[PDB]
């Protein structure tokens, strides 16, 4: 179902600090027609932590309603709340999202025990299929394999992973614990390539949303075992992949569209800034005309 | 203004999962008459992160009608979302709040420029002290000397830290850095003693919860420089200080309260649980029975 390169879409805003609904509908219309797989809303690239909860179930529900079953729609619905969670996990599924993203809760650091009732509650309060967005460079706390292995053999509805660790030894051992059934996607672009062969069949991108065509063309030459070709496409790409990185990547991507002229403001919300250093704009600027981006 | 023992107050919870409010303001005049010199409401140890912003708002509320004068009262007031953060941090000044406590935004891991639009941001919109929370083992990201200072000398309403880094060398570039009259509160009982003669005046604390008369006993010593009395309060608190961070110190600290005969329940909320392995609990009790309770 989710497959190849899926855009964790960012949230355009209006100079006014709204939701760029326009902006937002043609930024999908786009994604699709480049060739994303799939759809990811209101995830960590999506800014989920400084929209309220009506902007949050707002956006899930537009990229839903653009989506309009061409791509499946997986949305953000996990905080470090298991009661919030629910709630936004419920609003995905009552609105006709295709699967959740649900992250390990970051800050409060529940321990197994936590992790097991967390996923557990949710799990149980939708019948959607959950993906565990694993990413302790963000949470610190990390799911283990037998974790991730006893909460698979629990919950039928707990199907696949974000993996964002960027240790690819982890792919075998939650194949191997799991099984080949378990659907493993990457939440690290720069070592997507090495996921895939390992067991992986897709990505949560950052640089799907700079650069859908080549991102899909990466993914479509790795699940046709076309390896050579995908070696060529991370060459090109990895210059990317890194410069997006430097600064926070939502500021990075936003930068990047705006000078592709996509209809995207600079706009992010703090703790974020749009202020980018020269040599951070240059990084990006160079790894852009590299692929050759710009018309 | 904060000295000595200052708890980071528990958020007690009713079976029903409601505030237990009677529970709140026991704890708080408890705290008080054992001596704790201040009142942290709904910080990390008050489960911040599963209040609802109503709830949040009730226990800082609550906690500073309670206190009525009598002890200085530091809200909890920051998020990973700053509009969130100024939001709370307003609510906190307009209920009669003396300072606010704002944790460096976690998961969303802003830069440096992302630090000093958050804590600058929260600085613009009150008037009451503010005191930086530095938790890298919590949120990650570090903010470095250079930044603290940056909004001391900025901002003369940024005036202390609770530092809970446990790495001391900080509290003596902190010292020189932001200077004499900056206020160095540890948020790690384990090394507070330390803290404290490289420039600190007090311990915003997990394990005064449970101990309050000891632990504000231990900080006077070292206020009247009495360092053999303090180390020998070490030795008797040491072992309680690890017992209730084995497991996460919410459940840890309202475990050993029940144990002690306080009317606090066993409640905490998803993601963290109550249950605590035998070998937990029996660590927590030994722990006690050190300072007295069999006895």
Known sequence: ????????????????????????????????????????????????????????????????????????????????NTKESIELAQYAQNTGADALLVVVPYYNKPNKKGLLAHFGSIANAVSLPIYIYNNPSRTVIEMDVDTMAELVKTYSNIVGVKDATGRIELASGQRIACGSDFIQLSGDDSSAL?????????????????????????????????????????????PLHQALFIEPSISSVKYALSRLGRNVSLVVRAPMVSILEKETMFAIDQALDHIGLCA
Chains 1, 2 share one sequence.
């Open 1 to 80: 179902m989710f497959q190849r390169s899926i855009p964790a879409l960012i949230t355009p805003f209006t100079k006014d600090n709204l939701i760029d609904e326009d902006s937002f509908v043609d930024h999908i219309e786009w994604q699709i027609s480049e060739g994303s797989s799939g759809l990811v809303p209101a995830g960590t690239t999506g800014e989920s932590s400084t929209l309220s909860y009506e902007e949050h179930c707002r956006v899930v529900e537009l990229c839903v309603k653009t989506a309009a079953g061409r791509v499946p729609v997986m949305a953000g619905a996990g905080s470090n």
């Open 194 to 238: 090495g996921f895939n062969v390992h067991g992986g069949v897709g990505c949560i991108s950052v640089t799907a949303n700079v650069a859908p065509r080549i991102c899909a063309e990466f993914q479509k030459a790795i699940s046709e075992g076309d390896y050579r070709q995908a070696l060529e496409y991370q060459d090109k790409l990895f």
